[PDB]
Amino acid sequence: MDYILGRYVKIARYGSGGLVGGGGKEQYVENLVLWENIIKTAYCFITPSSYTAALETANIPEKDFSNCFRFLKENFFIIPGEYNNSTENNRYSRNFLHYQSYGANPVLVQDKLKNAKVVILGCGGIGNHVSVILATSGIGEIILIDNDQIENTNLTRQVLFSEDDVGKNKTEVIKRELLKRNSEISVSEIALNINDYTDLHKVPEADIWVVSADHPFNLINWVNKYCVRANQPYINAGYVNDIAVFGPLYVPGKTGCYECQKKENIDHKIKLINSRFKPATFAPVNNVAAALCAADVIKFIGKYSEPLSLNKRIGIWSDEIKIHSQNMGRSPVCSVCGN
Amino acid sequence: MDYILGRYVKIARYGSGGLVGGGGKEQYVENLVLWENIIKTAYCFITPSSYTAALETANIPEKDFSNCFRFLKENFFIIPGEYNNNNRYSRNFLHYQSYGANPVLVQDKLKNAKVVILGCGGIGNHVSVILATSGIGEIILIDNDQIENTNLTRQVLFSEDDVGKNKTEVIKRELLKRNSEISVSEIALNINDYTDLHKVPEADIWVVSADHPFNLINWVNKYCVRANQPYINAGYVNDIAVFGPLYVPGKTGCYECQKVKENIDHKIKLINSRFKPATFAPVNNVAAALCAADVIKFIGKYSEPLSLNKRIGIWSDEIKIHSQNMGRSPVCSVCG
Ligand SMILES: Nc1ncnc2c1ncn2[C@@H]1O[C@H](COP(=O)(O)CP(=O)(O)OP(=O)(O)O)[C@@H](O)[C@H]1O
Ligand SMILES: Nc1ncnc2c1ncn2[C@@H]1O[C@H](COP(=O)(O)CP(=O)(O)OP(=O)(O)O)[C@@H](O)[C@H]1O
Ligand SMILES: [Zn+2]
Numbered sequence: 001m002d003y004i005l006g007r008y009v010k011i012a013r014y015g016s017g018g019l020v021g022g023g024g025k026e027q028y029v030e031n032l033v034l035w036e037n038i039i040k041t042a043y044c045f046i047t048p049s050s051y052t053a054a055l056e057t058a059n060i061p062e063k064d065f066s067n068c069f070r071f072l073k074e075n076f077f078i079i080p081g082e083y084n085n086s087t088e089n090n091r092y093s094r095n096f097l098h099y100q101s102y103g104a105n106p107v108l109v110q111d112k113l114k115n116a117k118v119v120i121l122g123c124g125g126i127g128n129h130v131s132v133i134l135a136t137s138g139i140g141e142i143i144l145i146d147n148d149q150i151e152n153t154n155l156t157r158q159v160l161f162s163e164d165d166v167g168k169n170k171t172e173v174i175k176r177e178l179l180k181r182n183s184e185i186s187v188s189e190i191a192l193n194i195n196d197y198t199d200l201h202k203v204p205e206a207d208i209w210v211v212s213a214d215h216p217f218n219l220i221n222w223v224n225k226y227c228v229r230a231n232q233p234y235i236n237a238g239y240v241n242d243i244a245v246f247g248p249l250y251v252p253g254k255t256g257c258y259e260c261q262k263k264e265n266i267d268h269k270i271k272l273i274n275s276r277f278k279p280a281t282f283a284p285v286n287n288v289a290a291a292l293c294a295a296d297v298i299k300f301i302g303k304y305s306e307p308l309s310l311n312k313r314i315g316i317w318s319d320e321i322k323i324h325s326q327n328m329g330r331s332p333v334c335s336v337c338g339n
Numbered sequence: 340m341d342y343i344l345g346r347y348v349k350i351a352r353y354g355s356g357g358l359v360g361g362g363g364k365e366q367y368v369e370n371l372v373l374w375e376n377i378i379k380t381a382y383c384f385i386t387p388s389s390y391t392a393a394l395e396t397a398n399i400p401e402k403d404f405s406n407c408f409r410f411l412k413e414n415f416f417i418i419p420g421e422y423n424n425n426n427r428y429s430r431n432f433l434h435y436q437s438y439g440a441n442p443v444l445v446q447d448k449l450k451n452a453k454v455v456i457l458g459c460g461g462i463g464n465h466v467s468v469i470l471a472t473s474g475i476g477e478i479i480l481i482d483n484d485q486i487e488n489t490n491l492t493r494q495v496l497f498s499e500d501d502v503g504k505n506k507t508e509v510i511k512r513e514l515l516k517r518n519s520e521i522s523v524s525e526i527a528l529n530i531n532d533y534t535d536l537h538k539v540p541e542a543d544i545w546v547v548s549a550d551h552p553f554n555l556i557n558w559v560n561k562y563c564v565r566a567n568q569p570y571i572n573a574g575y576v577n578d579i580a581v582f583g584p585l586y587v588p589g590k591t592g593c594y595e596c597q598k599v600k601e602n603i604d605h606k607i608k609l610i611n612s613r614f615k616p617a618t619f620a621p622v623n624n625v626a627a628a629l630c631a632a633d634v635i636k637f638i639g640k641y642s643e644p645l646s647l648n649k650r651i652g653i654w655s656d657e658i659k660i661h662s663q664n665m666g667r668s669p670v671c672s673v674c675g
């Protein structure tokens with residue numbers, strides 16, 4: 001039963017002791033003696049070693065070594081030796097350190113991604129960015145859904161498209177560009193525009209729908225109603241001008257749905273104002289939303305960490321430093337998924 | 340003279356009264372009478388109108404109209420009509436308008452700017468393409484590394500058939516395909532010592548995402564303070580996306596301002612030298628996106644970059660954003 005120090009752990013001289021690890025799992029250990037001991041025991045696991053083989057080379061008392069071993073193990077700084085049983089030349093090897101760092105076997109996450117099927121409903125700015133992440137991360141099957149054609153104004157956010165692509169179907173060029181990046185996956189396209197609730201029946205079953213299409217105004221309400229009735233997982237992502245939005249991620253029976261937590265003259269005026277609405281699109285906002293959405297899809301399917309947007313619609317601001325989550329937990333009294 | 344309603348304005352009935360605006364400027368107006376008066380005033384500007392003309396068009400008293408007009412005007416829900424002006428960058432125009440800038444003037448500032456991309460990996464790929472398609476006039480790409488198959492997970496400009504080619508080379512080609520209106524430049528360089536930074540050209544700003552050695556950004560900091568050179572750092576610490584600081588000579592603190600045993604150190608240095616980040620495209624892309632937002636804003640001058648005086652971290656396994664103060668230090672070791 002070998003263990004090996006993760007390649008993603010770093011330690012630093014800091015404060016009265018030091019830091020162990022990098023990122024979300026970073027620990028500040030205030031006691032210098034303990035921290036120095038943690039370093040000494042980590043060093044013993046640089047090569048793949050059983051507990052007792054590493055202990056043999058440690059110059060500290062067994063009880064101190066044992067405590068440090070446990071610390072390292074619980075945070076996945078040391079990982080089973082087999083979790084490093086893949087070639088450095090594997091195209092997905094960088095994601096592997098990421099999987100390892102959450103205590104998962106990267107070969108098993110990869111196999112889950114390989115066998116998954118994802119629907120990209122909406123192939124604009126969000127769909128462009130989500131689809132390449134999912135494609136190059138090894139999701140086995142991607143189905144691109146969109147009826148629109150590429151324009152010159154798309155080139156701002158829609159990173160797969162070029163000047164030369166103007167006039168072609170979006171789904172056509174994305175497929176071309178996805179397969180140029182990862183030819184070991186399968187990519188299909190459906191030419192569909194969702195005019196009515198009934199149109200959603202032409203969208204295929206999948207592990208998850210990535211929904212970024214936002215026309216008409218109640219498209220999401222149709223998608224949610226449909227997915228509740230079809231028992232189909234979906235995630236929403238987009239933006240409200242300068243705020244990046246992703247979530248909720250809907251899982252049948254395991255999470256709340258979109259609807260759970262929800263003068264004629266002026267009424268005419270509101271409607272006209274809203275009819276003329278066009279979002280202040282901004283690539284960085286689009287990209288943040290799409291990045292975090294894809295992370296939640298990879299985690300939903302990989303199963304190695306909890307998706308952020310379970311039971312939540314998450315907003316990330318671009319002009320102030322702010323995240324806010326909006327409660328979208330299950331309501332027993334919901335008219336869509338309820339009693 | 341003339342004022343027009345922004346297309347990015349959204350309006351909903353909510354609770355007591357309603358909401359005016361979408362996104363960061365979204366405002367709850369409790370007073371329903373004031374809420375209705377706002378929409379009555381806004382409605383007269385859907386089609387461009389002068390102050391006085393809209394007053395005679397609205398069915399509300401001159402005092403209520405002045406209040407609602409100022410409300411819309413200060414929040415940039417209504418803008419000067421000339422700002423309204425199909426275009427390549429027409430999409431970004433609503434963004435600049437929403438912050439009370441003339442898009443044409445912002446667009447011009449971008450057209451006249453030079454950006455250095457110091458590091459053409461994951462962060463470089465994504466930063467450079469946002470900048471190119473937003474219309475930064477000159478982009479200088481700097482890297483001495485070749486494309487590998489393992490790059491394709493997050494280095495979005497690169498395909499399988501590009502493996503073995505130079506990064507600067509392929510980024511340039513792909514940038515030019517997406518925006519032919521700009522000029523792209525490459526330099527084959529790797530920063531081996533602090534003294535190699537003199538070979539980096541003068542720009543409006545440096546995007547620093549190079550991450551070898553550990554002390555690269557420390558070198559970059561000291562040089563940029565010396566060269567009077569604006570720079571912004573961006574990257575990640577495993578699962579945490581990082582951007583900032585944005586160093587502006589004479590305005591902000593530098594990277595080293597707030598500074599935010601034989602047997603042991605030998606083992607530390609051996610462990611640390613084996614380090615490899617747990618890279619993850621989503622984390623790459625957030626850092627790069629928010630960094631690119633700060634560059635556009637710094638150069639476009641229409642909003643304050645978020646990372647002035649701050650190193651910002653966005654968590655990926657938690658809903659969390661945290662900021663470290665990098666304000667000016669008089670007793671700093673590099674500047675001050
Ligand atoms: N009902 C629908 N059925 C199929 N596709 C739709 C759709 N509504 C929108 N889409 C597609 O989904 C993408 C996003 O659409 P919307 O966000 O509603 C307006 P947009 O600003 O054109 O999005 P974009 O910026 O992502 O292109 C577009 O490519 C569009 O073609
Ligand atoms: N001193 C230096 N001078 C110039 N460029 C540098 C540099 N150090 C690093 N870089 C460049 O900055 C980029 C950083 O790339 P990243 O995507 O952050 C990690 P990577 O090393 O590309 O991934 P890998 O570990 O899978 O190879 C690389 O393209 C690298 O060539
Ligand atoms: Zn419900």
Ligand SMILES: [Zn+2]
Nearest residue numbers: 593595596671
């Ligand atoms: Zn300083």
